[PDB]
Design a protein around this ligand. Structure first.
Ligand SMILES: [Mg+2]
Ligand SMILES: [Mg+2]
Ligand SMILES: [Mg+2]
Ligand SMILES: [Mg+2]
Ligand SMILES: [Mg+2]
Ligand SMILES: [Mg+2]
Ligand SMILES: [Mg+2]
Ligand SMILES: [Mg+2]
Ligand SMILES: [Mg+2]
Ligand SMILES: [Mg+2]
Ligand SMILES: [Mg+2]
Ligand SMILES: [Mg+2]
Ligand SMILES: [Mg+2]
Ligand SMILES: [Mg+2]
Ligand SMILES: [Mg+2]
Ligand SMILES: [Mg+2]
Ligand SMILES: [Mg+2]
Ligand SMILES: [Mg+2]
Ligand SMILES: [Mg+2]
Ligand SMILES: [Mg+2]
Ligand SMILES: [Mg+2]
Ligand SMILES: [Mg+2]
Ligand SMILES: [Mg+2]
Ligand SMILES: [Mg+2]
Ligand SMILES: [Mg+2]
Ligand SMILES: [Mg+2]
Ligand SMILES: [Mg+2]
Ligand SMILES: [Mg+2]
Ligand SMILES: [Mg+2]
Ligand SMILES: [Mg+2]
Ligand SMILES: [Mg+2]
Ligand SMILES: [Mg+2]
Ligand SMILES: [Mg+2]
Ligand SMILES: [Mg+2]
Ligand SMILES: [Mg+2]
Ligand SMILES: [Mg+2]
Ligand SMILES: [Mg+2]
Ligand SMILES: [Mg+2]
Ligand SMILES: [Mg+2]
Ligand SMILES: [Mg+2]
Ligand SMILES: [Mg+2]
Ligand SMILES: [Mg+2]
Ligand SMILES: [Mg+2]
Ligand SMILES: [Mg+2]
Ligand SMILES: [Mg+2]
Ligand SMILES: [Mg+2]
Ligand SMILES: [Mg+2]
Ligand SMILES: [Mg+2]
Ligand SMILES: [Mg+2]
Ligand SMILES: [Mg+2]
Ligand SMILES: [Mg+2]
Ligand SMILES: [Mg+2]
Ligand SMILES: [Mg+2]
Ligand SMILES: [Mg+2]
Ligand SMILES: [Mg+2]
Ligand SMILES: [Mg+2]
Ligand SMILES: [Mg+2]
Ligand SMILES: [Mg+2]
Ligand SMILES: [Mg+2]
Ligand SMILES: [Mg+2]
Ligand SMILES: [Mg+2]
Ligand SMILES: [Mg+2]
Ligand SMILES: [Mg+2]
Ligand SMILES: [Mg+2]
Ligand SMILES: [Mg+2]
Ligand SMILES: [Mg+2]
Ligand SMILES: [Mg+2]
Ligand SMILES: [Mg+2]
Ligand SMILES: [Mg+2]
Ligand SMILES: [Mg+2]
Ligand SMILES: [Mg+2]
Ligand SMILES: [Mg+2]
Ligand SMILES: [Mg+2]
Ligand SMILES: [Mg+2]
Ligand SMILES: [Mg+2]
Ligand SMILES: [Mg+2]
Ligand SMILES: [Mg+2]
Ligand SMILES: [Mg+2]
Ligand SMILES: [Mg+2]
Ligand SMILES: [Mg+2]
Ligand SMILES: [Mg+2]
Ligand SMILES: [Mg+2]
Ligand SMILES: [Mg+2]
Ligand SMILES: [Mg+2]
Ligand SMILES: [Mg+2]
Ligand SMILES: [Mg+2]
Ligand SMILES: [Mg+2]
Ligand SMILES: [Mg+2]
Ligand SMILES: [Mg+2]
Ligand SMILES: [Mg+2]
Ligand SMILES: [Mg+2]
Ligand SMILES: [Mg+2]
Ligand SMILES: [Mg+2]
Ligand SMILES: [Mg+2]
Ligand SMILES: [Mg+2]
Ligand SMILES: [Mg+2]
Ligand SMILES: [Mg+2]
Ligand SMILES: [Mg+2]
Ligand SMILES: [Mg+2]
Ligand SMILES: [Mg+2]
Ligand SMILES: [Mg+2]
Ligand SMILES: [Mg+2]
Ligand SMILES: [Mg+2]
Ligand SMILES: [Mg+2]
Ligand SMILES: [Mg+2]
Ligand SMILES: [Mg+2]
Ligand SMILES: [Mg+2]
Ligand SMILES: [Mg+2]
Ligand SMILES: [Mg+2]
Ligand SMILES: [Mg+2]
Ligand SMILES: [Mg+2]
Ligand SMILES: [Mg+2]
Ligand SMILES: [Mg+2]
Ligand SMILES: [Mg+2]
Ligand SMILES: [Mg+2]
Ligand SMILES: [Mg+2]
Ligand SMILES: [Mg+2]
Ligand SMILES: [Mg+2]
Ligand SMILES: [Mg+2]
Ligand SMILES: [Mg+2]
Ligand SMILES: [Mg+2]
Ligand SMILES: [Mg+2]
Ligand SMILES: [Mg+2]
Ligand SMILES: [Mg+2]
Ligand SMILES: [Mg+2]
Ligand SMILES: [Mg+2]
Ligand SMILES: [Mg+2]
Ligand SMILES: [Zn+2]
Lengths: 59, 140, 101, 19, 116, 112, 52
RNA sequence: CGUGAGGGAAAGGUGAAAAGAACCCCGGGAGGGGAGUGAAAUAGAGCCUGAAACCGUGGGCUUACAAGCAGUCACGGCCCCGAGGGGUUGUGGCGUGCCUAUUGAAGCAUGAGCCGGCGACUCACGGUCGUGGGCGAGCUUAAGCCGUUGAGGCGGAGGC
RNA sequence: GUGGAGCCUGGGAGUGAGGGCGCGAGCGAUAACGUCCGCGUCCGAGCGCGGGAACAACCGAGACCGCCAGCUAAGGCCCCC
RNA sequence: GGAUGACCCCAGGCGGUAGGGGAGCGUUCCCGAUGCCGAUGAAGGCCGACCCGCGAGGGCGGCUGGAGGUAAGGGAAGUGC
């Protein structure tokens, strides 16, 4: 190995073009059938403690 | 006074029978047509040439021993990927490409030249599909 | 009716009503000058050989100006040769009054 | 194939003391 | 007395950078790259001013040439006749006439055919 | 009317925070709140604070209805960097930039 | 550069440093270093001809 | 920093006056938004002015069949300002960075990441030409003395 | 023969690695983008312009600035052009 | 030509490295200055498609800035990256 190095400074354009995939994806959320709060699906609602109809955990 | 530049023109369609004509000497005329260098308001930076329809491209004629000797060539990018195809075979297999390849290489290189090549409609056999635009039979 | 006239070593198509810029002439503003005629066309078509004998074009000189400054610069690499020149070509502004036959 | 044996142009690289 | 750079160099650099608006990347943002770019620009403009006069002439000819073959002669033949006739209407106007005044152009052709 | 909040000298790196701020720009105050709550990024904590303060300013100061609020503008600016030494091999000493952010959120009223 | 207060030590070796070559920091090329052809005390007087 | 001799930095400015922002609001705080002071608060203490590289938000024009020292010349489209102009750039033409060193460099030869600031033909004395003046078989004083306190004289030793 | 000719006396220089081509020789092998002289030339300093596909020195020709005017040079006129 | 560097007329020169010569621009400081510009806004900064100049530059307008700046004509340099 002989210590590779960049040959030329990456332009403002080329680096930002690299970053055209860096956009975050917003959390996927559904309303809770009980208390109507927004939460991620297939989780136990951290607002009321309900999942699949019953109360599962203390909120 | 500034030089006249034309507002958008209606392009003219044209039908040419290639049968019997020499490959290169028809190729030349078609190119001229495509660039529209036969109209007095010719502008180099727009496509206001003609649409050229050619029939009987398979019946194009060629001097000398070029049937057996003129070799068209294709490089594939891979090692040993140079294909050599003779005129005879091309005519036999993709005849409409003969006239097309000749005409293409007489068109300019670049974005406009490429757009003009698309205004060349070449067919083997005596018929063409473009009845809709009713091309003018041209003697060239 | 239009005329092809020669002035300032160039040639221009002119017609009544035309305001026109040409190489500076030696006429006081407001005065009128008679331009040579190479050709007339429209109703009658008459062809100069090179200029037509009777014809003339009467133009009123609105005045004289200087074209927007053009920067003429010369550069020569690896030899430290750089020159910068500002150029404003003078002109005369004409009002084409009439075409005489 | 070259017959006259051709001598090394460069020495084997050796490290320097690093300032 | 001492005369530090003060205000001079910034002001010079601004001149160049202003003269470089529109350029890609550092060519419009960095004085040094701006400078280099402008050096080229000046030479091209000078060169192209010269060559513009050629670009338009070639255009005129091509247009004249096409308008002649509508009358059964070519550019070179047309110009000779035009010469033998003693008609001095330049190409800038020939080509204008070819487009805007075909009758006038048609007259001109006849005279040129006759003059040969 | 607009309301605005700014968090300055927040010790987080602008590139990282901006990623989050991007998620809520032009969004309702209501959706923004939902988004930040389940955004698995450290920045989400900070951006949430600025969001709320602006809404607070909107309601409490500038006579705007909490229900009509949305994120009209939002942007992260670079603040001063805490330059730090990172010791490396063979005696070399690198410099680390603990970057710092200026988070700005600006709220407006959706008259529709 | 000899009237300036720094020592005459060569700041780092001539070669193999990866950096430009230098001597002492009193060099006029350095910020803080000596000045080159700067003013010294001077007598601006001369003897204009008495007749003049 | 160095065992030591020794080396040896960086770092100035709110405002006329602290009148240095009570109190309220979000926040754990930091920070902000109102209120208040001020002629001025993007003069708010991370404080005069506040350039540039660099980063970001909004907007106009533009770009996913196209070949490049990035420009330049022409034309067209769109946007903006009031037979005109500014911005942008689609197509066409042309087009081998800058500096250095060289017989010859775009050169695959040197140097430069980019920006800002520092950075290199001076001075004393003597010489030699040219030159602006004064005087001219002559020209001129040096140290010093006197005077002035930004006043100029005297001094002929000596020099050519 | 009045020319950015010439001669004279002075002040300031740079230069004292040249290179290609044609011709004349030597060296070399009737080799070298070879080497060394002589005459000339161009590049050097005209890597400004047209031609030679491209290309310092081959051909054409010595760019003060402007023009969307005209005539030529070499070279070209089937299409790219 | 006029009467002397006023401007007009005609004719010719005007590629350029090392280098010689000429004419200018800008920077800091001095005389001009016990003056003059300046809160009705100094210097500096951001703009300008405007005006002058071959150009280096100089004006002028808008914005910022908030206390300095400095003429015609001369003088001296830590004078232009
Ligand atoms: Mg290993
Ligand atoms: Mg960019
Ligand atoms: Mg960007
Ligand atoms: Mg990239
Ligand atoms: Mg045919
Ligand atoms: Mg081409
Ligand atoms: Mg003109
Ligand atoms: Mg003129
Ligand atoms: Mg160069
Ligand atoms: Mg070059
Ligand atoms: Mg050279
Ligand atoms: Mg300096
Ligand atoms: Mg710019
Ligand atoms: Mg660039
Ligand atoms: Mg130039
Ligand atoms: Mg130029
Ligand atoms: Mg020409
Ligand atoms: Mg002729
Ligand atoms: Mg003619
Ligand atoms: Mg028409
Ligand atoms: Mg997530
Ligand atoms: Mg609230
Ligand atoms: Mg480690
Ligand atoms: Mg480590
Ligand atoms: Mg260690
Ligand atoms: Mg770093
Ligand atoms: Mg980094
Ligand atoms: Mg930071
Ligand atoms: Mg010392
Ligand atoms: Mg010392
Ligand atoms: Mg000391
Ligand atoms: Mg020593
Ligand atoms: Mg070294
Ligand atoms: Mg290095
Ligand atoms: Mg010092
Ligand atoms: Mg010195
Ligand atoms: Mg020194
Ligand atoms: Mg000294
Ligand atoms: Mg001094
Ligand atoms: Mg001195
Ligand atoms: Mg002296
Ligand atoms: Mg110690
Ligand atoms: Mg203060
Ligand atoms: Mg104070
Ligand atoms: Mg507060
Ligand atoms: Mg607080
Ligand atoms: Mg007040
Ligand atoms: Mg108040
Ligand atoms: Mg006031
Ligand atoms: Mg405030
Ligand atoms: Mg301000
Ligand atoms: Mg202030
Ligand atoms: Mg600061
Ligand atoms: Mg102050
Ligand atoms: Mg400030
Ligand atoms: Mg600031
Ligand atoms: Mg953007
Ligand atoms: Mg394709
Ligand atoms: Mg496309
Ligand atoms: Mg492309
Ligand atoms: Mg290219
Ligand atoms: Mg065109
Ligand atoms: Mg345009
Ligand atoms: Mg182009
Ligand atoms: Mg340069
Ligand atoms: Mg070298
Ligand atoms: Mg290259
Ligand atoms: Mg290069
Ligand atoms: Mg390279
Ligand atoms: Mg090397
Ligand atoms: Mg290189
Ligand atoms: Mg070397
Ligand atoms: Mg170098
Ligand atoms: Mg390097
Ligand atoms: Mg480095
Ligand atoms: Mg940079
Ligand atoms: Mg000297
Ligand atoms: Mg002397
Ligand atoms: Mg003397
Ligand atoms: Mg005397
Ligand atoms: Mg005496
Ligand atoms: Mg005394
Ligand atoms: Mg001479
Ligand atoms: Mg001579
Ligand atoms: Mg000298
Ligand atoms: Mg020698
Ligand atoms: Mg020789
Ligand atoms: Mg020799
Ligand atoms: Mg040789
Ligand atoms: Mg021969
Ligand atoms: Mg030989
Ligand atoms: Mg022989
Ligand atoms: Mg031989
Ligand atoms: Mg030989
Ligand atoms: Mg020779
Ligand atoms: Mg040389
Ligand atoms: Mg020569
Ligand atoms: Mg060349
Ligand atoms: Mg080359
Ligand atoms: Mg040139
Ligand atoms: Mg060529
Ligand atoms: Mg060549
Ligand atoms: Mg060669
Ligand atoms: Mg050449
Ligand atoms: Mg001719
Ligand atoms: Mg010929
Ligand atoms: Mg040819
Ligand atoms: Mg042709
Ligand atoms: Mg004259
Ligand atoms: Mg002349
Ligand atoms: Mg000449
Ligand atoms: Mg010259
Ligand atoms: Mg000043
Ligand atoms: Mg005073
Ligand atoms: Mg004074
Ligand atoms: Mg004063
Ligand atoms: Mg006043
Ligand atoms: Mg006031
Ligand atoms: Mg003001
Ligand atoms: Mg000052
Ligand atoms: Mg100015
Ligand atoms: Mg101002
Ligand atoms: Mg004061
Ligand atoms: Mg003065
Ligand atoms: Mg005086
Ligand atoms: Mg100096
Ligand atoms: Mg610098
Ligand atoms: Zn729930």
């Amino acid at each position: 190995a002989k210590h590779p190095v960049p040959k030329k400074k990456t332009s403002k354009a080329r680096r930002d073009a690299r970053r055209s995939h860096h956009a975050l994806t917003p959390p996927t959320l559904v309303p809770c059938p009980e208390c109507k709060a927004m939460k991620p699906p297939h989780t136990v609602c951290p607002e009321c403690g309900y999942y699949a109809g019953r109360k599962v955990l203390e909120v | 006074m500034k030089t006249y530049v034309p507002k958008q023109v209606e392009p003219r369609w044209v039908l040419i029978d290639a049968e019997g004509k020499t490959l290169g000497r028809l190729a030349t005329k078609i190119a001229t047509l495509l660039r529209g260098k036969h109209r007095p308001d010719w502008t180099p930076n727009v496509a206001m040439g003609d649409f050229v329809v050619v029939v009987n491209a398979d019946k194009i004629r060629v001097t000398g021993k070029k049937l057996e000797q003129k070799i068209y060539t294709r490089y594939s990018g891979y090692p040993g990927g140079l294909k050599k195809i003779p005129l005879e075979k091309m005519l036999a297999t993709h005849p409409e490409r003969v006239l097309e390849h000749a005409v293409k290489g007489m068109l300019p290189k670049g974005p406009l030249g490429r757009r003009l090549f698309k205004r060349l409609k070449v067919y083997a056999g005596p018929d063409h599909p473009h009845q809709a635009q009713r091309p003018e039979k041209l003697e060239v | 009716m239009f005329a092809i006239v020669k002035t300032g070593g160039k040639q221009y198509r002119v017609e009544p009503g035309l305001k026109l810029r040409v190489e500076k002439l030696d006429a006081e503003p407001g005065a009128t000058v008679e331009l040579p005629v190479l050709l007339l066309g429209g109703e009658k078509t008459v062809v100069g050989t090179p200029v037509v004998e009777g014809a003339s074009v009467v133009a009123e000189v609105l005045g004289h100006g200087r074209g927007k400054k053009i920067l003429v610069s010369k550069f020569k690499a690896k030899v430290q040769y750089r020159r910068k020149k500002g150029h404003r070509q003078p002109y005369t502004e004409l009002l084409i009054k009439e075409i005489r036959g | 194939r070259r017959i006259r044996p051709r001598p090394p142009r460069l020495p084997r690289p050796r490290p320097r003391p690093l300032p | 007395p001492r005369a530090k750079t003060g205000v001079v160099r910034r002001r010079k650099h601004k001149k160049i950078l202003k003269l470089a608006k529109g350029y890609w990347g550092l060519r419009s943002k960095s004085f040094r790259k701006a400078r280099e770019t402008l050096f080229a620009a000046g030479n091209y403009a000078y060169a192209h001013r010269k060559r513009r006069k050629r670009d338009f002439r070639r255009l005129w000819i091509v247009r004249i040439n096409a308008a002649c073959r509508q009358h059964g002669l070519n550019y070179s033949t047309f110009i000779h006749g035009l010469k033998k006739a003693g008609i001095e209407v330049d190409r800038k106007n020939l080509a204008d006439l070819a487009v805007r005044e075909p009758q006038v152009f048609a007259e001109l052709v006849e005279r040129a055919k006759a003059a040969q | 009317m607009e309301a605005k909040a700014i968090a300055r000298y927040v010790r987080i790196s602008p590139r990282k925070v901006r990623l989050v701020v991007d998620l809520i720009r032009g969004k309702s105050l209501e959706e923004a709140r939902n988004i930040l709550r389940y955004t698995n990024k450290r920045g989400a904590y900070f951006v949430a604070k600025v969001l709320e303060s602006a809404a607070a300013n909107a309601v409490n100061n500038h006579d705007m209805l909490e229900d009509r609020l949305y994120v009209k503008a939002a942007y992260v600016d670079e603040g001063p960097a805490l330059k730090r030494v990172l010791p490396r091999a063979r005696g070399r000493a690198d410099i680390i930039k603990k970057r710092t952010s200026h988070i700005t959120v600006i709220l407006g009223e959706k008259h529709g | 550069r000899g009237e300036v207060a720094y020592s005459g030590r060569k700041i780092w070796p001539q070669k193999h440093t990866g950096r430009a070559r230098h001597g002492d920091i009193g060099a006029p090329i350095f910020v803080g270093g000596g000045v080159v052809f700067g003013p010294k005390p001077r007598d601006y007087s001369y003897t204009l001809p008495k007749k003049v």
